[PDB]
């Protein structure tokens, strides 16, 4: 889960394939759910959060 997100991680930002090269990309698209960084995205995926 960690290596796939770090090397092949690409967000769907406004119907576009935007790589997760910055935490502000994930925060701008998943900040509504208290997800702010890439390790928070990994944590949600790995532990299957709410």
């Amino acid at each position: 889960v960690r290596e796939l997100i770090y090397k092949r991680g690409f967000g769907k930002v406004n119907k576009q394939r935007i790589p997760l090269s910055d935490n502000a990309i994930i925060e701008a698209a998943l900040g509504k759910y208290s997800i702010l960084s890439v390790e928070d995205l990994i944590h949600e995926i790995y532990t299957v959060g709410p």
Binding site: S37, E39, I45, Y46, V48
Partner: protein, 50 residues
């Protein structure tokens, strides 16, 4: 973000060790401990579109 990342890594280590300790206790006591099924599944497509 750094504090959140440290907490996640601490949670992973504790969750892995407790699984090991539970299995060790069941093995010593002679009982059988079945780990919980996983909620996360990584699916890869192997056949083409034809």
């Amino acid at each position: 973000i750094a504090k959140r990342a440290e907490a996640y890594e601490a949670e992973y280590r504790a969750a892995e060790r407790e699984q090991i300790e539970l299995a060790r206790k069941a093995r010593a006591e002679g009982n059988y401990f079945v780990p919980h099924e996983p909620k996360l599944i990584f699916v890869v497509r192997i056949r083409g579109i034809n």
